[PDB]
């Protein structure tokens with residue numbers, strides 16, 4: 374075999390055009406519901422939950438199906454988790470007696486600027502966006518688990534292990550619903566004796582809650598020109614691990630943040646370190662890097678691992694034990710990047726569209742609120758008559774009206790010029806100055822709205838123009854390698870199936886990427902999926918994709934300079950097995 378025809382997924386090579394599928398029967402069974410939700414995350418659950426609450430209250434019949442990639446609810450949830458109860462309490466005011474895991478109220482807020490050798494404390498005032506009074510630090514994965522339970526209790530039909538891989542359209546052109554991934558296909562594309570076609574879930578309205586950079590929404594944006602009046606979404610990559618530390622250095626309810634070292638003024642990013650108070654002396658810590666970074670030699674992961682060695686942070690994990698690892702991409706575009714949320718037959722909610730309060734690093738509370746509103750507005754239209762036709766799929770335009778008048782809108786508006794102010798000659802340090810001027814003093818009142826530099830993908834410089842970064846070697850106690858890390862994420866997929874990291878053209882990673890940027894996919898991926906392998910013999914290399922290690926963070930679909938990669942879902946159930954991350 375060859376070069377090696379790295380891509381074989383049906384989305385790029387339709388099996389309706391390859392002979393090997395000549396006699397297979399593609400007939401799918403189908404299920405009818407009123408509302409189908411895609412993604413069992415905080416938003417998707419909020420929507421599902423609220424819809425069944427409304428149904429019960431006015432006692433009417435509502436079938437609500439919720440699909441999820443994860444083997445089980447919460448398995449794919451990754452966050453640091455500092456929660457603003459606002460939307461959650463709205464949905465579950467009775468939460469304290471029903472068991473929800475909000476057990477760590479924030480007690481101390483800290484923030485510092487790091488240099489190679491020192492930590493410079495920054496005062497945090499009562500107006501600023503890094504305040505956390507009345508907020509809780511949680512284990513998002515557990516909370517989501519808890520929510521799924523309530524949902525199930527309310528009568529929501531949850532289907533974990535089922536990934537939506539196809540968008541179903543009606544003949545008029547509106548969304549009819551989705552189809553779950555098929556199963557039983559070999560790495561090469563050929564159907565296995567165990568081939569089975571996925572499920573078809575038809576609804577009047579489909580909710581898309583795929584989170585940050587969902588793959589369905591990605592094609593949804595094109596189909597209905599949803600990004601027509603906004604700037605492209607900009608992202609960051611968040612790396613995280615869980616630690617068990619010395620009870621002596623545990624300070625429950627403390628929330629830490631930092632900026633600076635090991636990053637250079639022009640690379641947006643920082644850490645977060647949260648002391649849980651759920652029983653064990655447990656720490657939730659991480660690092661974020663803005664995927665708008667310029668140097669091809671930069672590695673988010675090596676930066677993270679390198680960060681824990683700062684003399685202000687190392688002592689705290691000194692003699693501790695790391696028990697988990699994971700990564701997820703997050704939104705940073707904020708206000709300027711919110712697209713049109715509705716189209717005939719479906720809605721967008723949560724971080725798929727993007728309601729992230731970047732400076733606060735909070736996107737859970739808004740995510741939930743959007744789910745609440747979505748649910749209310751959809752109930753409002755199935756409970757009425759007044760037909761909007763020639764779109765067999767409803768267009769719940771009222772969802773967007775209501776979202777714009779909620780606190781969500783004004784919250785994101787108020788912090789819209791913070792991230793953008795980081796593109797000055799002072800990089801993020803200038804952004805800090807902006808926060809003290811225009812926000813602490815004017816609470817974001819300024820009569821203008823700054824713009825983003827554009828897509829994160831064209832922000833990379835050619836390798837020959839940059840200097841490579843010399844990262845330390847992991848000591849195996851504070852900093853670890855990539856493979857032990859992937860191991861601690863619990864991620865796994867059936868090996869015999871086409872790689873879900875699809876390529877539009879199998880030649881650009883070697884001709885363009887390795888050539889010009891020196892293969893950045895080998896470093897921006899936090900799970901070592903892409904590697905450039907020497908060729909059997911002659912010269913050059915070949916790209917080897919170890920799809921089995923993918924932790925579904927979506928960073929590659931975002932950062933690839935050649936926008937040649939398109940993340941798609943692998944058989945349902947595959948992926949990380951996160952527990953309380």
Ligand SMILES: Cc1cc2nc3c(=O)[nH]c(=O)nc-3n(C[C@H](O)[C@H](O)[C@H](O)COP(=O)(O)OP(=O)(O)OC[C@H]3O[C@@H](n4cnc5c(N)ncnc54)[C@H](O)[C@@H]3O)c2cc1C
Nearest residue numbers: 412414415416442452453455537584611723724735736737
């Ligand atoms: C490092 C880091 C730190 C953070 N810290 C905070 C913090 O302190 N406070 C805060 O409020 N927020 C924080 N966030 C943000 C928070 O995690 C998100 O805004 C929030 O989870 C977004 O939620 P969502 O409901 O849209 O779904 P997500 O949690 O993004 O979940 C989407 C779900 O959909 C499933 N899914 C995706 N595509 C499909 C498909 N095709 N078919 C089926 N299922 C699918 C996924 O498996 C996933 O379970 C942080 C994020 C990161 C990465």
Ligand code: SF4
Nearest residue numbers: 898923924926927929
């Ligand atoms: S291959 Fe998977 S894990 Fe690696 S960056 Fe791309 S999405 Fe993230």
